[PDB]
Ligand binder design. Sequence first.
Ligand SMILES: O=C(OC[C@@H]1O[C@@H](OC(=O)c2cc(O)c(O)c(O)c2)[C@@H](OC(=O)c2cc(O)c(O)c(O)c2)[C@@H](OC(=O)c2cc(O)c(O)c(O)c2)[C@@H]1OC(=O)c1cc(O)c(O)c(O)c1)c1cc(O)c(O)c(O)c1
Length: 205
Amino acid sequence: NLCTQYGWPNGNYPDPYDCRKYISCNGAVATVMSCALGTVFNPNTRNCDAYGNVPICQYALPSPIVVTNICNQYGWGNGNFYHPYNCAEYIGCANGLTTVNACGAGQYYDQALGRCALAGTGYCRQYVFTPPPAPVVYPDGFDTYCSANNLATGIHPDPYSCFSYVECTFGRTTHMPCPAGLSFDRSLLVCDGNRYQNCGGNVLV
Ligand SMILES: O=C(OC[C@@H]1O[C@@H](OC(=O)c2cc(O)c(O)c(O)c2)[C@@H](OC(=O)c2cc(O)c(O)c(O)c2)[C@@H](OC(=O)c2cc(O)c(O)c(O)c2)[C@@H]1OC(=O)c1cc(O)c(O)c(O)c1)c1cc(O)c(O)c(O)c1
C-alpha cells in the first residue's frame, strides 16, 4: 500500500487523481475514501472541506484537480513548489504564470531538495505535517504582540499557526496567512513550500 511505500504516518493524504477523494492511512494501510458531496479534500487541512474553500478542486469537471492557475489564484512567488495532490508532480511559478511539471518514472518530487529524486526510504514528505487549528484563535491582547515583546519592524513567525506570519509595523501587530498551500519558514522569514519543516512533519516521522 502507498502508506508504507512512502514511509507515511497514519493520517490523510491527497488522492492524486480525484480531489473529491483522498487516501486514508489507517493501521499503516491505504484506503481510498470519498469526501461527502459538497466537500472536497483540502490539502492544507488534510481533511474534506467545503468545496468553496478549495478552488483548485473543480468538482464539476471530469478531471477536477485544476492547479493550472495556482500561482495566480493563490499568489505564489517564483520558484518550484510541491504539487498539492500529486507527489510525482510539481509546480513552476514565474511572474504569476503556472507550469505543471512531472518527475520521471520511479521519481518523486522532493520539496526540500527542490527537484525530482529516486524513491528512497521515506519520501513524499511534503504531505506529512500538522495543520494549524481550525479556526486559529488568537488570545485577547494579541493586537499588542509586537509592542509587548519589543519585536522589530518587519516579519516574524506567528506562534499560533505555521500557515501564518506576524507583521510588526509602527509597533502595530498584524497576522496574515501565507498564500494557501504555503507555510511560514521560521529560518528564512518567508512563506514557502516546506510544510514538512514548517508545520512539524519531522516529529511525525
Ligand atoms: O485565494 C483563495 O483562497 C485563499 C482564502 O480566500 C478566502 O476564502 C475565500 O476566498 C472563499 C471563497 C469562497 O467562494 C468560499 O466558498 C469560501 O469558503 C472561501 C479567505 O478565507 C476566508 O474564508 C475568510 C475568513 C475570515 O475570518 C474573514 O474575516 C474573511 O474576510 C475571509 C482567505 O483567508 C483569510 O483571509 C484569513 C485571514 C486570517 O487572519 C486567518 O486567521 C485565516 O484563517 C484566514 C484566504 O486567502 C489567504 O489566506 C491569503 C492571504 C494572503 O495574505 C495571501 O498573500 C494569499 O495569497 C492568500 C481563493 C481564490 C478564489 O479565486 C476563489 O474562488 C476561492 O474560492 C478562494
